[PDB]
Amino acid sequence: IGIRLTLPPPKVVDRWNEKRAMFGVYDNIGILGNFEKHPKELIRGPIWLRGWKGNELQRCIRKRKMVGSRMFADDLHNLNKRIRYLYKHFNRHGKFR
Template identity: 60%
Template sequence: MAALVRGLMRRVVALPQAVRSVSGGGQRHEPYRPLPITSPLAGLPRNFRVREPPKPQKVDRWTEKRALFGVYDNVGILGEVSPYRLRALGGRGRRPEAAASGFQIHPKHLIMGPKWLRGWRGNELQRCIRKKQMVGDRMFMDDYHNLKKRIRFLYKRFNRTGKHR
């Protein structure tokens, strides 16, 4: 049995060498020449290409499509003004935009939230002070205490750091 195995081992043909490559294979530009086993590049092809990242493209941000994106989104929410309504509003001689204030719902009526915050702008400290003035007398004791603590903390923070010093 051992003689048979030795005989078969002598006739074994060398298998083709597996080739690793950085670029994932593909067409080679020159014939494959194996490197010595001691080389750090053993198993890698000799000439692998390093691809450069694509150059940034110049994009025109003011094309008609980009400039008018979302212009008519409010029509679905607020409803469209009919031409008869425009004529009744005096839109014949003027620009139609000037007379087109006849929407069914105005955007300010779609804003949800407390009455004392609708359409008001300000930072967190100003908002907390406004809340204390408007609804402070009707708040629970714990909520009122936490609001006063928050105002104290924000007052210190705003006076010590930031562009509003």
């Protein structure tokens, strides 16, 4: 029970598909391009996460600030509750003070 009885379908990786072969190209776009662009401008993703990092409370606060006016009501309500929950957790509970 719990362990598969046949080998899984073999996994073939093309180590030289175009995505892998060109990975990292232009990561020095600033230092090699007269700093017209910053490498963070190459990051694609949510508008609230490009070239920025934080813990989960900071991300939720940042997402609420920037796209919160555009969120669906159920999702915005969950985000409000999540911020409140993390607010209590990070400010009032834990081993260290």
